């Protein structure tokens, strides 16, 4: 009942599913957790970084797209770079042609369209990456989520990756507070949600946390290493 | 060149002279300018001779494929369309000026086709460097619904006008008569021109030409 239907993105299963798309989504579920949330004025991304060994640097999770847009990634690194490069190019083209920033919802539509194409053609494969997209434009702050299925979602807040269900539960619990939060409070909420994804013994540190922020008076900025310290203290102990 | 055509009571008469020139020298005294298109359609040609030859040959061939497929006799309109669409695509660079005539299921039809791809459907037409001389004959004498012999006379008179008044035209008159019941390809129809009789006898004996080398190669 499964094996003949699971190798080709062009093969529908008898249940109306495409197993290659479901399998690409497992790449994201096994990525390290990331959280995105927004207030009325800011969009924030928070990401756990994995280090393969004790002497490796932690893998980048947060990438600059344009002054008004950044992304957090979960899944295949090389697919994330490909999609980020596409997003960057669409943003440059908009500024070249129109001399104004590409609206964030339009960029997400373009990702949906681009990522849908290989799901329908023989010998191609879905993108094995999920994105959280933080942006600010004329319609305010945004958090979008994109998926290997090519579907995308407009979010009050979201978490993807390993044990992200825990983060999602925290986010639902506190989301009625987010709109009115100052930036410090909002980032703290992001970090608390992300901390829920950790085994009981592990903590947020300057080595494993990455932060991205964009807003009304703030171009998309990435905070790593010593620069996350202001945000980590913070923070009620677990 | 002088080429021409008329619609008569029962069909079409086409006509042509037989001179081909290269510059202001006669190359061929007996060029055939009335080309086969199909058993019921012929086409006189003027303009660049290679282009009229190859264009008529191509359309004749494509029309044969067409009739082989349909099992029907071809239509003059079909030859017209094929010719004009090709000439148009080439933008006048194929120098074929054509008088296309035939008889199909809808009766007799006559078209002039120009190098840029324009066509005119008309009861009489002329083309070539003699075309004004031939047209003058037609304007003066054409009547609708002529009988076969009158139409043949008229066309040969028109071709003759080109022959005698256009330096580009000469030698014989060819006609082609096409009706529902018959095709008469009349080559030559008339021979108004003849080389004068030779008066001085040359007759050069063997050994008149000095030879430096010789090789005989026996065959088969």
């Amino acid at each position: 009942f499964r094996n003949q239907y699971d190798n080709d993105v062009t093969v529908w299963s008898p249940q109306g599913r495409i197993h290659q798309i479901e399998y690409a989504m497992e790449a994201v579920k096994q990525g390290s957790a990331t959280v995105g949330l927004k207030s009325k004025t800011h969009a924030v991304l928070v990401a756990l970084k994995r280090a393969q060994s004790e002497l490796a640097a932690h893998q980048k999770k947060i990438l600059h797209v344009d002054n008004h847009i950044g992304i957090s990634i979960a899944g295949l690194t090389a697919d994330a770079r490909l999609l980020c490069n596409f997003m960057r190019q669409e943003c440059l083209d908009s500024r070249f042609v129109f001399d104004r920033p590409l609206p964030v919802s339009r960029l997400v539509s373009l990702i949906g369209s681009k990522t849908q194409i290989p799901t329908q053609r023989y010998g191609r494969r879905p993108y094995g990456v999920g994105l959280l997209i933080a942006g600010y434009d004329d319609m305010g702050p945004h958090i979008f989520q994109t998926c290997p299925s090519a579907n995308y979602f407009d979010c009050r807040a979201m978490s993807i990756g390993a044990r992200s269900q825990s983060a999602r539960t925290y986010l639902e619990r506190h989301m009625s507070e987010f709109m009115e939060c100052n930036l410090n409070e909002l980032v703290k909420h992001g970090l608390r949600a992300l901390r829920e994804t950790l085994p009981a013994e592990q903590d947020l540190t300057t080595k494993n946390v990455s932060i991205g922020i964009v807003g009304k008076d703030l171009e998309f900025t990435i905070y790593d290493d010593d620069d996350v310290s202001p945000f980590l203290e913070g923070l009620e102990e677990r | 060149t002088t080429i021409a055509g008329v619609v008569y009571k029962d069909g079409i008469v086409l006509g042509a002279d037989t001179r081909a020139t290269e510059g202001m020298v006669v190359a061929d005294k007996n060029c055939s300018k009335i080309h086969f298109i199909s058993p019921n359609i012929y086409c006189c040609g003027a303009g660049t001779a290679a282009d009229t030859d190859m264009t008529t040959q191509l359309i004749s061939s494509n029309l044969e494929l067409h009739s082989l497929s349909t099992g029907r006799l071809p239509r003059v309109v079909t030859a017209n369309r094929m010719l004009k669409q090709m000439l148009f695509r080439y933008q006048g660079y194929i120098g074929a000026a054509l008088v296309l005539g035939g008889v199909d299921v809808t009766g007799p039809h006559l078209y002039s086709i120009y190098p840029h791809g324009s066509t005119d459907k008309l009861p009489y037409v002329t083309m070539g460097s003699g075309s004004l001389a031939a047209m003058a004959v037609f304007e003066d004498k054409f009547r609708p619904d002529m009988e076969e012999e009158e139409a043949k006379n008229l066309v040969s008179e028109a071709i003759a006008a080109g022959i005698f008044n256009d330096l580009g035209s000469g030698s014989n008159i060819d006609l082609c008569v096409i009706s529902k019941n018959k095709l008469d390809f009349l080559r030559p129809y008339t021979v108004p021109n003849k080389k004068g009789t030779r008066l001085g006898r040359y007759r050069c004996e063997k050994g008149t030409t000095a030879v430096l080398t010789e090789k005989i190669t026996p065959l088969e």
Partner: protein, 235 residues
Amino acid sequence: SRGSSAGFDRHITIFSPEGRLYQVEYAFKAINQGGLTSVAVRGKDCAVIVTQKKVPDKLLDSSTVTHLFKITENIGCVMTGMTADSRSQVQRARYEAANWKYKYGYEIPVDMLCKRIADISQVYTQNAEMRPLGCCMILIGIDEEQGPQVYKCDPAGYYCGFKATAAGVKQTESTSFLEKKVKTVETAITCLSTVLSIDFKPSEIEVGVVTVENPKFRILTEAEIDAHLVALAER
């Protein structure tokens, strides 16, 4: 032999050991999936097409439920089989006819249109990467020399001209009915009624006609269909 199979001969259009093309044979079964039957008959004066019109729903806009299509002003058609496949083949026919007229300066003959569609279908029986279309096309028109014409082509790329013919679920029973008779509008509707055992309301069939007097393809209204049903009913 007798139903033998090797390798992929049930999946793609390659020969079976008997020299059969199972994928083509299956395309004929696809024609019956729609559950409809169509009939066409020619006489000296006209050619007619009739088919069932099933509108079980009523939430349907019934004026959009048709299997009759105009190809040119003077060529009509009835499609039988898979609906989307059929619509595609109608579009192709329309294109072929229009292109013919543009290139050759006269309307495509019905036999030539049928042949062209049949030749296009042939390709699908010889190239492995696409399936045949699971539909059958019946064409009617007036030929200036031969009179009314009815032509049929199928997923194998066979085609023929007919005195009368049928397609779909009751094709074989329609063929027997029409054979017995042949040894026009009333024949077509009687054949269809007999083989289905229905006795029709005017909203349950569609009829299209071409005539030597009026070569333009015409679809009968309900009232026009009813005048035939009533004339028949009174034997």
